[PDB]
Design a protein around this ligand. Structure first.
Ligand SMILES: COC(=O)c1cn(C[C@H](CC2Cc3ccccc3C2)[C@H](O)c2cc(OC)c(C)c(OC)c2)cc1CC(=O)O
Ligand SMILES: CCCCCC/C=C\CCCCCC(=O)OC[C@@H](O)CO
Length: 385
């Protein structure tokens, strides 16, 4: 005969087989990890709730990008509830957990991660669309955001159910991991490489945005700097090379909504016709058409500038939220890889430290929006009254 793959005393037989703790009495550091854990959880459930109400009541925050930020806060709010149930069942209370309740606390944490991972992935796509135009907002996108929120939460529920739908070492006791005694090694290798490849493709998304913005500002720098060169009363040869640098920078910036798309070729024509005047010998007409180009770039600087500064201010804030997410979650996910692919090389003692490091990030997001966003910082003072 064999014991049940579903008993209450079963936490002890999974935890003893693998290189993991099983406590009976209340330790000194176990009380502080729980004490600090709940204190952080209450703050997450308050700070992320504050920013969710702030987007809901303020008129300026009724845009597809700010609705996704509220869902990211809702994912952290869910994480606050997930870590709360975890910290209440740590140390001597771990023995009290059954096979079903163990998968529940571990499942809620796996659901909360992919909820924030898919949210940041959706924000990365949202910023990748707005930058290929100026702004992306019609009422149809607001209705589409509701559908996107469903996709994010559906994928979170499914990813947090995959190990609880057969992919576990429950009745495959030989293939159990040292960190999670009820989770399979094949799942943890898959889960860690899935979340890390998502971080890499997200970095590529923003690197493609920042790289393109760099080429725009560079070609706009080449535009304004060589404009000053032409203006200077020199020889015909001095104007030709500057206008050649003017044309090449315009056609490079062309490799990018209708109003801005047509705007580039208007500038190419004014440069190419000014070049023809200079090739004839008319140095005057080449410099006269250059000031005509100055009155055209100053017109488009009113329609795109003041608006791109508000876009880049929010773009940087998003990368800080994503940056902090990678720096804290990567050591914990690398720890999962070293758990099954590195046996006897290093002890997995720093498991309480990396757990709290990822937990603090759920509280870091409203702190980031408080000092970066100018309009949101004034909405926070209104909540106290
Ligand atoms: C205070 O809790 C612990 O020290 C602890 C550490 N672990 C191990 C592990 C924690 C380590 C593995 C990991 C992964 C990401 C971030 C940190 C850590 C540490 C945890 O199961 C886990 C696995 C897990 O992967 C399925 C994920 C995503 C987690 O979210 C943070 C947490 C379990 C516990 C609770 C206990 O056994 O009483
Ligand atoms: C009241 C509001 C909603 C009522 C529905 C709440 C659904 C929460 C699902 C959490 C999850 O992913 O499950 C984990 C399981 O896999 C563990 O076994």
């Amino acid at each position: 005969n064999e014991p049940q793959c579903f008993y209450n005393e079963s936490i002890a037989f999974f935890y003893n087989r693998s290189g993991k703790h099983l406590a009976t009495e209340w330790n000194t550091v176990s009380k502080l990890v729980m004490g600090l854990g709940i204190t952080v959880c209450i703050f997450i459930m308050l700070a992320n709730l504050l920013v969710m109400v702030a987007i809901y009541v303020n008129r300026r925050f009724h845009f597809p990008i700010y609705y996704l930020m509220a869902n990211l806060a809702a994912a952290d709010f869910f994480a606050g509830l997930a870590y709360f149930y975890l910290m209440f069942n740590t140390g001597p209370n771990t023995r009290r957990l059954t096979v079903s309740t163990w998968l529940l606390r571990q499942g809620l944490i796996d659901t909360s991660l992919t909820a924030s991972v898919a949210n940041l992935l959706a924000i990365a796509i949202e910023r990748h669309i707005t930058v290929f135009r100026m702004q992306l907002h019609t009422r149809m996108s607001n209705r589409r955001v509701v559908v996107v929120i469903v996709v994010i939460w559906t994928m979170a529920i499914v990813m947090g159910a995959i190990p609880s739908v057969g992919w576990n070492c429950i009745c495959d006791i030989e293939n159990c991991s040292n960190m999670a005694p009820l989770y399979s090694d094949s799942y943890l290798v898959f889960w860690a490489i899935f979340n890390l490849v998502t971080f890499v493709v997200m970095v590529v998304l923003y690197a493609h945005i920042f790289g393109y913005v760099a080429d725009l500002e560079d070609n706009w720098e080449t535009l304004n700097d060589n404009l000053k060169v032409i203006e200077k009363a020199d020889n015909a040869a001095q104007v030709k090379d500057a206008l050649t640098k003017m044309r090449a920078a315009a056609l490079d910036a062309q490799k990018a909504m209708k109003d801005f798309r047509h705007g580039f070729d208007i500038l190419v024509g004014q440069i190419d016709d000014a070049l023809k005047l200079a090739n004839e010998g008319k140095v005057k007409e080449a410099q006269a058409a250059a000031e005509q180009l100055k009155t055209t770039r100053n017109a488009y600087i009113q329609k795109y500038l003041r608006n791109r500064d508000t876009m880049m201010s929010l773009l940087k804030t998003v990368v800080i939220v994503l940056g902090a997410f990678i720096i804290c979650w990567t050591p914990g996910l690398v720890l999962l890889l070293l758990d099954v692919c590195c046996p006897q090389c290093d002890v997995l003692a720093y498991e309480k430290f990396f757990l709290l490091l990822a937990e603090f990030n759920s509280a870091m997001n409203p702190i980031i929006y408080s000092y970066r966003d100018k309009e949101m910082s004034a909405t926070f003072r209104q909540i106290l009254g």
